[PDB]
Amino acid sequence: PTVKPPTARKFIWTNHKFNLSGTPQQYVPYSTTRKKIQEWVPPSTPYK
Amino acid sequence: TRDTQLITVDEKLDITTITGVPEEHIKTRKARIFVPARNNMQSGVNNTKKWKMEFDTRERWENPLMGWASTADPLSNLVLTFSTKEDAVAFAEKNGWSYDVEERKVPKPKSKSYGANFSWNKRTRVSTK
Amino acid sequence: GVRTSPTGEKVTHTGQVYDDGDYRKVRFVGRQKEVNENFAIDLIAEQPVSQVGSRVISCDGGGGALGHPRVYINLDKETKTGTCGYCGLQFRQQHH
Amino acid sequence: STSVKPIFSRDMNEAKRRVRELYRAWYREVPNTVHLFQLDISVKQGRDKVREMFKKNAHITDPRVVDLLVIKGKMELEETIKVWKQRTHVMRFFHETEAPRPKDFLSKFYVGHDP
Amino acid sequence: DTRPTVRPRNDVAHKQLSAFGEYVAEILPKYVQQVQVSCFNELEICIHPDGVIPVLTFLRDHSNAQFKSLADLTAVDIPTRQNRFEIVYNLLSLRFNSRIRVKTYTDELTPIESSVPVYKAANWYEREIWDMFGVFFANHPDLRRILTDYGFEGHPFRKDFPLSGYVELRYDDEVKRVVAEPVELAQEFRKFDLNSPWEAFPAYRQPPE
Amino acid sequence: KLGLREIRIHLCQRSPGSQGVRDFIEKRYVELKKANPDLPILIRECSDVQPKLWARYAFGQEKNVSLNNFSADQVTRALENVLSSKA
Amino acid sequence: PSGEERCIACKLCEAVCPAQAITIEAEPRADGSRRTTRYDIDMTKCIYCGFCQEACPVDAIVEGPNFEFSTETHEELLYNKEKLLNNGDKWEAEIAANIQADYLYR
Amino acid sequence: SNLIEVFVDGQSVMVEPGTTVLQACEKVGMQIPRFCYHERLSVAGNCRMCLVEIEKAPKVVAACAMPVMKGWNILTNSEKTKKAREGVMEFLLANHPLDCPICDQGGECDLQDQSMMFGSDRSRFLEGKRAVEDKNIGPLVKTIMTRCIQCTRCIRFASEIAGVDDLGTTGRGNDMQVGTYIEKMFMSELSGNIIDICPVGALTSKPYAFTARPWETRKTESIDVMDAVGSNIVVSTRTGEVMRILPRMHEDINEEWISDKTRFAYDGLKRQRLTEPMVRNEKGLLTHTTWEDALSRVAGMLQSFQGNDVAAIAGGLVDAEALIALKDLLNRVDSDTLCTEEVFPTAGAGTDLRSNYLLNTTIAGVEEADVVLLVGTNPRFEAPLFNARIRKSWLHNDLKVALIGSPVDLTYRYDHLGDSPKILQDIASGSHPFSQVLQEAKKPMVILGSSALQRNDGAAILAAVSNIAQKIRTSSGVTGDWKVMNILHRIASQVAALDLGYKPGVEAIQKNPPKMLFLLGADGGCITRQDLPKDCFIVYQGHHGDVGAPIADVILPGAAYTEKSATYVNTEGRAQQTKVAVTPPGLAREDWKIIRALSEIAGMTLPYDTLDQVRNRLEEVSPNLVRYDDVEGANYFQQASELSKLVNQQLLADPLVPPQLTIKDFYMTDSISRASQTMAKCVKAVTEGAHAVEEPSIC
Ligand code: SF4
Ligand code: SF4
Ligand code: SF4
Numbered sequence A: 001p002t003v004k005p006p007t008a009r010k011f012i013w014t015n016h017k018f019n020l021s022g023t024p025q026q027y028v029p030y031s032t033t034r035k036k037i038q039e040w041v042p043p044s045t046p047y048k
Numbered sequence B: 001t002r003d004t005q006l007i008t009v010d011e012k013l014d015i016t017t018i019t020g021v022p023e024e025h026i027k028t029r030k031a032r033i034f035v036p037a038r039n040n041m042q043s044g045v046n047n048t049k050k051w052k053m054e055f056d057t058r059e060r061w062e063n064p065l066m067g068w069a070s071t072a073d074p075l076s077n078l079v080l081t082f083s084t085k086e087d088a089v090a091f092a093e094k095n096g097w098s099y100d101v102e103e104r105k106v107p108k109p110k111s112k113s114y115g116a117n118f119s120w121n122k123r124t125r126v127s128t129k
Numbered sequence C: 001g002v003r004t005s006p007t008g009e010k011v012t013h014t015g016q017v018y019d020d021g022d023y024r025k026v027r028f029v030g031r032q033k034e035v036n037e038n039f040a041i042d043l044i045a046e047q048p049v050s051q052v053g054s055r056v057i058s059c060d061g062g063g064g065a066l067g068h069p070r071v072y073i074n075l076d077k078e079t080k081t082g083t084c085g086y087c088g089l090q091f092r093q094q095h096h
Numbered sequence D: 001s002t003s004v005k006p007i008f009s010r011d012m013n014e015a016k017r018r019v020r021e022l023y024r025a026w027y028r029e030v031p032n033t034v035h036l037f038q039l040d041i042s043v044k045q046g047r048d049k050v051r052e053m054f055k056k057n058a059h060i061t062d063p064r065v066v067d068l069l070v071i072k073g074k075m076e077l078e079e080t081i082k083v084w085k086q087r088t089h090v091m092r093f094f095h096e097t098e099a100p101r102p103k104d105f106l107s108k109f110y111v112g113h114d115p
Numbered sequence E: 001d002t003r004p005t006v007r008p009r010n011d012v013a014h015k016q017l018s019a020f021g022e023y024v025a026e027i028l029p030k031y032v033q034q035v036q037v038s039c040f041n042e043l044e045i046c047i048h049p050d051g052v053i054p055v056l057t058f059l060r061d062h063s064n065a066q067f068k069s070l071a072d073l074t075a076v077d078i079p080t081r082q083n084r085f086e087i088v089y090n091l092l093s094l095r096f097n098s099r100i101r102v103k104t105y106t107d108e109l110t111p112i113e114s115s116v117p118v119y120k121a122a123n124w125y126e127r128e129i130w131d132m133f134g135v136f137f138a139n140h141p142d143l144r145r146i147l148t149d150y151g152f153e154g155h156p157f158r159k160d161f162p163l164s165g166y167v168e169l170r171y172d173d174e175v176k177r178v179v180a181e182p183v184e185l186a187q188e189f190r191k192f193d194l195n196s197p198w199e200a201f202p203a204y205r206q207p208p209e
Numbered sequence F: 001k002l003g004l005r006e007i008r009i010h011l012c013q014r015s016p017g018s019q020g021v022r023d024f025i026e027k028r029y030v031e032l033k034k035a036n037p038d039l040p041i042l043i044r045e046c047s048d049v050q051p052k053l054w055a056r057y058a059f060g061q062e063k064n065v066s067l068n069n070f071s072a073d074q075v076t077r078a079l080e081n082v083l084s085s086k087a
Numbered sequence G: 001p002s003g004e005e006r007c008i009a010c011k012l013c014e015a016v017c018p019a020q021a022i023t024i025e026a027e028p029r030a031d032g033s034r035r036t037t038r039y040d041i042d043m044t045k046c047i048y049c050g051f052c053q054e055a056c057p058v059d060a061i062v063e064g065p066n067f068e069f070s071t072e073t074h075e076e077l078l079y080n081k082e083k084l085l086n087n088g089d090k091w092e093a094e095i096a097a098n099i100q101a102d103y104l105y106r
Numbered sequence H: 001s002n003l004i005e006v007f008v009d010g011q012s013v014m015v016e017p018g019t020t021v022l023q024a025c026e027k028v029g030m031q032i033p034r035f036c037y038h039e040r041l042s043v044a045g046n047c048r049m050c051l052v053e054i055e056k057a058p059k060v061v062a063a064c065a066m067p068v069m070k071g072w073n074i075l076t077n078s079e080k081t082k083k084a085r086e087g088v089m090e091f092l093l094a095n096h097p098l099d100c101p102i103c104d105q106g107g108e109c110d111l112q113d114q115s116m117m118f119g120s121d122r123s124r125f126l127e128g129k130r131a132v133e134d135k136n137i138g139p140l141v142k143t144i145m146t147r148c149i150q151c152t153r154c155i156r157f158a159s160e161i162a163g164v165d166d167l168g169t170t171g172r173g174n175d176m177q178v179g180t181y182i183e184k185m186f187m188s189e190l191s192g193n194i195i196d197i198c199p200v201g202a203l204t205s206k207p208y209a210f211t212a213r214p215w216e217t218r219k220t221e222s223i224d225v226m227d228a229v230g231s232n233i234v235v236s237t238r239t240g241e242v243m244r245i246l247p248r249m250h251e252d253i254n255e256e257w258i259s260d261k262t263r264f265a266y267d268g269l270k271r272q273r274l275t276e277p278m279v280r281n282e283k284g285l286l287t288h289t290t291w292e293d294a295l296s297r298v299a300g301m302l303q304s305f306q307g308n309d310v311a312a313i314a315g316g317l318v319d320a321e322a323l324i325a326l327k328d329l330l331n332r333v334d335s336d337t338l339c340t341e342e343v344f345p346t347a348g349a350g351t352d353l354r355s356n357y358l359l360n361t362t363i364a365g366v367e368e369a370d371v372v373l374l375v376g377t378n379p380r381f382e383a384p385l386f387n388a389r390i391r392k393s394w395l396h397n398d399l400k401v402a403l404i405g406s407p408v409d410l411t412y413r414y415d416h417l418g419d420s421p422k423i424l425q426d427i428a429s430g431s432h433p434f435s436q437v438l439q440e441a442k443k444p445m446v447i448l449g450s451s452a453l454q455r456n457d458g459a460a461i462l463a464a465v466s467n468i469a470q471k472i473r474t475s476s477g478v479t480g481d482w483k484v485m486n487i488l489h490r491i492a493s494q495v496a497a498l499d500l501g502y503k504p505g506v507e508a509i510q511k512n513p514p515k516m517l518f519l520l521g522a523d524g525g526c527i528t529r530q531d532l533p534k535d536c537f538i539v540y541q542g543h544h545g546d547v548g549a550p551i552a553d554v555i556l557p558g559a560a561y562t563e564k565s566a567t568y569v570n571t572e573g574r575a576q577q578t579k580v581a582v583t584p585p586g587l588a589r590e591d592w593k594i595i596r597a598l599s600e601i602a603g604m605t606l607p608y609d610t611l612d613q614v615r616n617r618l619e620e621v622s623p624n625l626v627r628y629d630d631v632e633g634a635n636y637f638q639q640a641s642e643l644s645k646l647v648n649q650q651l652l653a654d655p656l657v658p659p660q661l662t663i664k665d666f667y668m669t670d671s672i673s674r675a676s677q678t679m680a681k682c683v684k685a686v687t688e689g690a691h692a693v694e695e696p697s698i699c
């Protein structure tokens, strides 16, 4: 890379990270979608 | 003719005991014997030729970790293909599944006339091509 | 860009964030929630619009065979910009 | 059409003779099974299980189906006698970890949608 | 044969296999129901299930046959037929450098004569068919499961058997052993509908009912 | 109490077995409804059913009377027994 | 190069995947773009066959050059869209150089 | 007899004269390629994809438009035929955009599929492509018109099926563009069907845009319940979620179309959903609880009360199983007060005879009628596919249609006799000229909308219209078995409720205010707490928090029509059963199971514990409710009329104004459609224009 450097993009990380497994920086998987079914919220007034 | 020396069994064929299927997936499952309906989005009719047998839909839920669709139904993706309704029914009977058959829906023949688009005294005249 | 909830959790580019009462945010205790920080919706908006001198322009994403399939964009409407359906670049006709 | 090639038995009397013969072999073998595999069950428990497995198919009336169940029963006996099965395979008959599932309507109604 | 992308047709082998097909049907009319040759030159003899031993012995031992090797013996499940199982024997003649296929049929409750007397290769092939399709072979030296787990219930290669089966295994610490539980999947297998609604092969179009 | 709440008559549109019940409905049903203004008498038809007379009293008890191959006169008595005598 | 995502939620990688390792969900974005809300690769289902990068029409999904990503837990190998976008951002410099060397054979 | 013999690939087939070469190939099983031809639209002949060789004829013929002639041999697989197909497919793809990845039609596209099967495998087009600007025709149909292939199916459909002449071609040549020319919306109760007939991604569903792919959806063949037509549908699901609704062809009901309420209201199933049982706390607020607790509170009140003190109102979207189960439970406390929100006059025969409250002629019979008299109904918005059947008969049979009611656009011209109900008396006597038209008609048809009967004078109108039907049937030369009187319902559960003996309308509940009320999905607002003893204990069962839930003591979540296998009876009396597509959300349970569970807690256990047993019970109450897809005819019209005359009620002088007058009243009519945000944008679009409904669309 000193002779043929890589192309620069803005989004490319400026600081490489090594394997973080087993540390507080590890990756925890999670669902990235939002809630599908919205639940009716009962009225907060005393009715009758 | 065939000379194996044969017996005569007059009972109905019933193979549930020898199939290895658990109890709950024979007594409680309702099969649907049907010809699939043509997908309305297309005009091809080659997927409406054969009879199908599918099972009632049971619960799917969200996996707590990734949100994937989890199931406890071993027959959820099970589909069988038959040439006739009588073939599909016989298979369900010997396997002990209860079934609701649905008769094939055949498109009716229509009367198409290109000359009717320019009729002289009828409403079939088109205002555009 | 990245927002945070009142609970402190980061909101991802899809808008996901565990709500106040969800127990599933326990998976991040002692660890971290991985959110990519370069929201493509923000980045594609920073691009300048390209002024062209024809009704119809083609976009292939740049790089030739390394982009997307080539498509043509009609630029007759002057109340909006033409947008690539693949890459999101914007084009406008130059008052011809 | 009702004429069908026999597997072994020509009628249900010949088939039930093989059912009893297989029950004797399984009945005799349970004490050895509990000993060799070092099962914590009692020999009475093992014989109640063998009996139970034999009542599931008590409604059958087709000689050919009866023969197959006997063929499969003798195959399972050989795996047990020759110790091809392991302790985990023997104890799968007793479903020791499966939690009891409700049979009535209300208990089944509270848990979910299954019939 | 000069179309770069199209498999060339070998008319000479088609004629020879057609002739030998009639030959087998003339000598064994008692068992042979159908004889056919494919467009890529593979001869098939369809027989009554009673003729397994006579047909296989003639092909192995006849001097104008000499199919001394059993390449394969397998089963196909077709639920739409009353005889849902199609038993297929693939045989190789090293003398004449030919292959032939012999097919017969059965159902769940009907035995098929074990062909171990003709080919000793068939012993394990029949155990496999018994285990995966539940077809019983009469007079087998030892018929028992070969591929499935000990005590496994069912015959997995039947079209009506579920892909993921009915039981799964885990190690339970309470009982200090591997236990079997009903099967649940964190992600259900996703069934894709792929068949196109437009006919692809007119030459195989079946007649209207 | 313990009085009749509802009557249902099931019959086939065309089968010979129901011929008696059809005659009753054509001739005598109008009077029956005018006699019992508030009692719901539900005449529900369906092809190829063995005709029956369902009567529902208080608290869900029900009785079924076959009418297969009855005559219009017999159907009238069958209804009379139900209307008059109430369990 | 602008920083917009290449993936258009066409789901051909999902269909071709022999292992059913890919789960995708999509919807219109605020600007109306066709984009994924879910892009999961189960790395313990995947056979690393590369059919998904062959199928993709926009080079959005690639198997990178990295082979040194062992984990201490099974959950760390179930990748969602954020992890995969971070892999591309992390490894873009090398990935692009390799695609440059091979795209004339593809 | 009149049949002529033609050959398809050397195979003889006997066809009626007038059969097209394309239809002759159908009878041997061969499907000719097509793009512009649709069996339910007029022949166009513009795509040229059906060109086929005729043996011993030099020029290929368009199969879709060419009638066969005696002795013709159609060569569908000939070299001349195949080369025609590759050429035409080559032209169709020359200017088509490379959009398949970003196009919702991908995977279910007749252009893609017919390219694979009848087109070349490569391109020799080395020029630039045409790019067309996109057009906004409303909130429900997205237009990427660069994908259009100019088949004019949308034009022919909108003109001929939907009776709307707003789509056309502008310009000519390669620049001929489909659209409206001006900025206009193609908003119709049937507008969403152009999406299906468009063979390409030019017209796609906006609500469905980008969410799924065809191959990954599971198809569940179910029934629509947004009205009383009973349209057969396909519910597409993926990973336990409903993705879209599609029509399923049923010839004798909906043909192959559905209304836009049926097609785009499913998004209402994901909002305002009841998912947990609820009881009132000390502060008087609804709070979540368990099934054990809620059903023990309902059983306590159910056991204490008895007789008339217990009542129930059923809503529009309630199936037969939940109806019979609740009738049995209330009968065991000795309550007959099973009411419905929809009113049907009870004087006379009432519900005793089926023929009194059914559309006896059936939807398919409309095509055989000679005169149709619509009384006090807007069938366009009450029964969109029934109205579409009238227009098909208007178009192809020269049907004469007359209307007694407010003048509403039905998409086809009609004879407006007037709006006053008194005209019905004139027609019967013979004063009004239309009476001759009805008398001479060989097969007349009279249709009374159930919306007319909601008036206080309903018993009068039903008597009058029934009288008109009898004279022209008995006292005129109408065929023996042509049934004239018809009632058009608008509520999915009505016909099933009436078959089970439910009392139509909430009159009984008003006459005897009960101390316990079961609101079985009753969201009509017919009975409010100002009409109740003030200590009333209301148990609401349903799937949406709308009107009933906020006024209830106990909420028992149920399943929507997509989440259960339930029986519904359409306006003709046909019984049809849905299937489970997805299971109920949260703690929601099947509707009849809640009642069976409640009955056991109250020591009143019902004699059915499975779906098959609760359908044997339906067979004991009405045998027709378990004959699926079979229309059981009714009869005894003469007897029904006799009882009708006795009372003689008096008509009022109010004009017959239908509840729905313009398209804006069509979209939001029940709890599912009120919760839908797509129907919310539909209502906004037709009342405010496209200014605030537009969304930027790129692909
Ligand atoms: S490399 Fe992995 S994710 Fe990609 S197609 Fe192959 S198995 Fe699927
Ligand atoms: S990664 Fe590529 S193939 Fe997969 S959905 Fe995105 S654009 Fe389509
Ligand atoms: S309509 Fe869409 S899916 Fe069909 S060929 Fe055109 S771009 Fe591809």
Ligand code: SF4
Pocket (backbone or CB within 6 Å): H147, H148, H149, H150, H151, H152, H153, H154, H155, H178, H197, H198, H199, H200, H202, H203
């Ligand atoms: S918009 Fe669709 S249906 Fe209308 S002409 Fe174009 S391709 Fe045909």
Ligand code: FES
Pocket (backbone or CB within 6 Å): H033, H034, H035, H036, H037, H044, H045, H046, H047, H048, H049, H050, H051, H062, H063, H064, H065
């Ligand atoms: S289908 Fe015949 S020309 Fe279009």
Ligand SMILES: [K+]
Pocket (backbone or CB within 6 Å): H105, H194, H195, H196, H197, H198, H199, H200, H201, H202, H203, H204
């Ligand atoms: K379309």
Ligand SMILES: [Zn+2]
Pocket (backbone or CB within 6 Å): C059, C060, C061, C068, C084, C085, C086, C087, C088, C089
């Ligand atoms: Zn682009």
